[PDB]
Design a binder for this molecule. Sequence first.
Ligand SMILES: [Cl-]
Ligand SMILES: [Cl-]
Ligand SMILES: [Cl-]
Ligand SMILES: [Cl-]
Ligand SMILES: [Mg+2]
Ligand SMILES: [Mg+2]
Ligand SMILES: [Mg+2]
Ligand SMILES: [Mg+2]
Ligand SMILES: [Mg+2]
Ligand SMILES: [Mg+2]
Ligand SMILES: [Mg+2]
Ligand SMILES: [Mg+2]
Ligand SMILES: [Mg+2]
Ligand SMILES: [Mg+2]
Ligand SMILES: [Mg+2]
Ligand SMILES: [Mg+2]
Ligand SMILES: [Mg+2]
Ligand SMILES: [Mg+2]
Ligand SMILES: [Mg+2]
Ligand SMILES: [Mg+2]
Ligand SMILES: [Mg+2]
Ligand SMILES: [Mg+2]
Ligand SMILES: [Mg+2]
Ligand SMILES: [Mg+2]
Ligand SMILES: [Mg+2]
Ligand SMILES: [Mg+2]
Ligand SMILES: [Mg+2]
Ligand SMILES: [Mg+2]
Ligand code: NA
Ligand code: NA
Ligand code: NA
Ligand code: NA
Lengths: 64, 64, 64, 64, 64, 64, 64, 64, 64, 64, 64, 64
Amino acid sequence: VFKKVLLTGTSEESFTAAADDAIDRAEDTLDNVVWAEVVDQGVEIGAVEERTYQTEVQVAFELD
Amino acid sequence: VFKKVLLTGTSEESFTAAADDAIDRAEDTLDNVVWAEVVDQGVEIGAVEERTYQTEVQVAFELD
Amino acid sequence: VFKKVLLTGTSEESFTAAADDAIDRAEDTLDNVVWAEVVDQGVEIGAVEERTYQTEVQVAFELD
Amino acid sequence: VFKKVLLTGTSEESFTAAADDAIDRAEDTLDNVVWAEVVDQGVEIGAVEERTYQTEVQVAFELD
Amino acid sequence: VFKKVLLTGTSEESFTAAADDAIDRAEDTLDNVVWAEVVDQGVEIGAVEERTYQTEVQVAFELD
Amino acid sequence: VFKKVLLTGTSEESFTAAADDAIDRAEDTLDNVVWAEVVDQGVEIGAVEERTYQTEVQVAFELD
Amino acid sequence: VFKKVLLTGTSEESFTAAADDAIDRAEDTLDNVVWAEVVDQGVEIGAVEERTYQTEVQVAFELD
Amino acid sequence: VFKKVLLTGTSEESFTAAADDAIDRAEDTLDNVVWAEVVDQGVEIGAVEERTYQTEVQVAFELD
Amino acid sequence: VFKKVLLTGTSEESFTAAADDAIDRAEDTLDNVVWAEVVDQGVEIGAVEERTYQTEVQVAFELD
Amino acid sequence: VFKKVLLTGTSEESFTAAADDAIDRAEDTLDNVVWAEVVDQGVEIGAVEERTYQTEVQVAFELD
Amino acid sequence: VFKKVLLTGTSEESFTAAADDAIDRAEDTLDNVVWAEVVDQGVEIGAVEERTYQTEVQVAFELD
Amino acid sequence: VFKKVLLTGTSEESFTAAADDAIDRAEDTLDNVVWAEVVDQGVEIGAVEERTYQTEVQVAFELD
Ligand SMILES: [Cl-]
Ligand SMILES: [Cl-]
Ligand SMILES: [Cl-]
Ligand SMILES: [Cl-]
Ligand SMILES: [Mg+2]
Ligand SMILES: [Mg+2]
Ligand SMILES: [Mg+2]
Ligand SMILES: [Mg+2]
Ligand SMILES: [Mg+2]
Ligand SMILES: [Mg+2]
Ligand SMILES: [Mg+2]
Ligand SMILES: [Mg+2]
Ligand SMILES: [Mg+2]
Ligand SMILES: [Mg+2]
Ligand SMILES: [Mg+2]
Ligand SMILES: [Mg+2]
Ligand SMILES: [Mg+2]
Ligand SMILES: [Mg+2]
Ligand SMILES: [Mg+2]
Ligand SMILES: [Mg+2]
Ligand SMILES: [Mg+2]
Ligand SMILES: [Mg+2]
Ligand SMILES: [Mg+2]
Ligand SMILES: [Mg+2]
Ligand SMILES: [Mg+2]
Ligand SMILES: [Mg+2]
Ligand SMILES: [Mg+2]
Ligand SMILES: [Mg+2]
Ligand code: NA
Ligand code: NA
Ligand code: NA
Ligand code: NA
């Protein structure tokens, strides 16, 4: 059985790096992370000093 | 990194109050709740004495 | 077996009340109304004296 | 010919009032506003003192 | 308040049995599982000895 | 001209059998049923003694 | 309150004429038809002597 | 950089002609119109003497 | 077993004729074309002398 | 690089078996079939002696 | 009240840089740009000497 | 007439490079590749030594 968690990663460099930021966090806390699916991408402009790319991912991990 | 949880709040008064019901529950248990996105709305009619409005929300919170 | 009818209710007060307007009509004519799912919301501005909120719902009822 | 503008209204009271906030702004600046379609709803929690409901609408107006 | 978890169950027999596999796992770990909504179906062919049907479900459970 | 009715069939056995349950009901009451399109699938867990699979279908029938 | 019926009209001439075919049928049987929304378009090629255009519409009519 | 405007054209003849009606209006007021994407089609029946076809288009134009 | 190919037909006359243009091409090269489903419509304005309507279709054909 | 082909399988028994029917055909003609994603399900009722379940799948295969 | 404009940025380097190209243009002409949401990505191959990545964004800005 | 093929490219570097990987393969085998539309993005984590970005594209090419 796989479970997914819905995470938004952020990066000041790129959408790819924002995806990685989310996946890195998942791997810090979860065992057996297997894949991720991109579900949204965006850019924060007003609340930040530097534009921040965001990529939201469903991160799948195998239970047991 | 933000994480979202998918919650359905309920209210006998309104769709807004049902959203609040979900958000209230998130804030009881989670730190750093930042926003919520409505993903569905419905009304329970048959299994209840009074019509119950429901609003399903992705509730986002900041990790760390 | 459940069947759904696709109804648009209207209200000069709110989206919740417009949903109720549709559900009320369903209950006038149908037995065993069980739930409703919101599928669209809108506001009529030009053809009306007062802004009219509309909520379109699939209203489910149990056959037999 | 109708044209639509994509506006997000806000309210500390309700999703209906947030829709109105967007429509009010459209009517301040545009002639012949005819209808609005809700396309998204959300709640701002972290960046505000009071929860703020938001309703995003396509607001249609008649050209000429 | 209901919460949903997004689970992918698997089966070498059928899509129905894959849904059950996910629901069984939810019921092992959660109290008050109430319903599930199918959100995706697929078949694993290359990484397996026997074709494996998968059904991804949002599994809803009542909080408290 | 074809017309569709939106029916949810149920079964304690499978999603296929739940589709059939809806189609059977349509054929009891309508002439000239021609096809059905699956639009949703779900499982009722809490309100039932045995898990009940549901399949919602648009059932098309030829008018005249 | 408006209600919609989901009709597929057909024509050997065009998608517009297929929409009209559905609307004509609605107006034969229903009072107060107000609008229609196109939801799908297709072409039947194999089961027919001449290609047949089809347009599926939600046809809205005012109740009472 | 391209920008899109969301226009609904109308015609008493066809969906194609309604698309053209929107595009014509865009070309009256904008330089460098390059393409249009159909996003919705509908028919106005009740508020008009003759059925009026409508086609909503995103009309893209090149900035600078 | 049916297979679909995703084709974009073009016409300087109409969306219907653009669909036909795609279907004609499919029938030139494939046996047993049975139906087509419209998936997108657009208009090319800038790269052409005359506006060109386009209709993208999944064209289904029976294998064997 | 993976490529997908869009196939509709059929079965007089079940949606699972209809998926298999499509996948079987892909494996007859293609090397390195790896997975399939269900994209639609339906039932043919009028043109057949026995109800025929159909499952449409994107079947992915590895190029080279 | 926020308003969104729908812009397609382009880049010969990456999808991230194409998003930036759109956002840069918005910031040249608009005050109070706050965020952007990616709605589509594509690559122009035939009409260009070098492949050109495109990213279409809704760019939100605060009115007043 | 344009035809599209649905390809998933892969890269250990970025989503842009994964799109290119798919487009490169299309250009190896097809004449007159004109554009590509991104339809999905994902990351393979478990079955690989290094995270592999994937971008799925519809690649359009002109027939004849
Ligand atoms: Cl828009
Ligand atoms: Cl989710
Ligand atoms: Cl419907
Ligand atoms: Cl496809
Ligand atoms: Mg930096
Ligand atoms: Mg988002
Ligand atoms: Mg009360
Ligand atoms: Mg729901
Ligand atoms: Mg009042
Ligand atoms: Mg509507
Ligand atoms: Mg207050
Ligand atoms: Mg939003
Ligand atoms: Mg077995
Ligand atoms: Mg999936
Ligand atoms: Mg049993
Ligand atoms: Mg449902
Ligand atoms: Mg003729
Ligand atoms: Mg259809
Ligand atoms: Mg005329
Ligand atoms: Mg519309
Ligand atoms: Mg001509
Ligand atoms: Mg297109
Ligand atoms: Mg049999
Ligand atoms: Mg289908
Ligand atoms: Mg360069
Ligand atoms: Mg696009
Ligand atoms: Mg490397
Ligand atoms: Mg995918
Ligand atoms: Na989730
Ligand atoms: Na219906
Ligand atoms: Na817009
Ligand atoms: Na395809």
